[PDB]
Amino acid sequence: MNIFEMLRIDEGLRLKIYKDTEGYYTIGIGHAASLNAAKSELDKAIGRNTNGVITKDEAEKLFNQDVDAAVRGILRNAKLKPVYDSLDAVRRAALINMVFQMGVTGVAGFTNSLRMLQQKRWDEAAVNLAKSRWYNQTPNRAKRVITTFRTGTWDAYK
Numbered sequence: 001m002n003i004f005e006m007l008r009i010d011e012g013l014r015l016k017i018y019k020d021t022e023g024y025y026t027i028g029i030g031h032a033a034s035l036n037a038a039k040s041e042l043d044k045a046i047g048r049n050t051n052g053v054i055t056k057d058e059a060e061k062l063f064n065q066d067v068d069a070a071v072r073g074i075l076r077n078a079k080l081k082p083v084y085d086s087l088d089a090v091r092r093a094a095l096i097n098m099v100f101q102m103g104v105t106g107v108a109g110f111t112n113s114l115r116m117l118q119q120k121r122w123d124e125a126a127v128n129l130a131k132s133r134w135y136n137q138t139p140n141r142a143k144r145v146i147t148t149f150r151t152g153t154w155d156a157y158k
């Protein structure tokens with residue numbers, strides 16, 4: 001398992017623009033954004049007039065771009081970079097997963113959890129991570145991500 005397979009599980013795959021529960025237009029593997037504005041962003045991202053329908057290959061390329069953006073966001077952030085560097089490969093994926101979902105600023109706001117992860121106090125980190133609005137909003141996913149941070153294994157995704 002790697003970050004790509006993990007996020008694919010958490011984000012699913014859609015080949016036609018869809019409006020999620022919070023009102024955002026989304027497509028591909030968690031590529032989120034009016035509809036005209038959404039299609040404009042998508043067309044620029046894909047490189048053609050898609051009219052809202054794309055191929056699996058295009059979804060994967062977009063996904064690859066979005067994952068790269070999350071990784072670079074972590075590395076360019078003073079609070080997240082040190083934590084990421086200190087983590088093993090599996091826990092690093094959980095951090096990328098969080099950034100992919102909520103953005104760099106959002107994850108950087110998890111002060112207690114970040115400090116605990118840096119100190120390898122996995123259970124303390126898990127306790128703090130669950131005490132969040134993020135967790136309460138998308139709990140099934142948060143539980144998988146937290147279990148990953150806690151154990152350093154892919155158990156929650158198998």
Ligand SMILES: [Cl-]
Nearest residue numbers: 110111112113
């Ligand atoms: Cl926190």
Ligand SMILES: [Cl-]
Nearest residue numbers: 131132133134
């Ligand atoms: Cl919060």
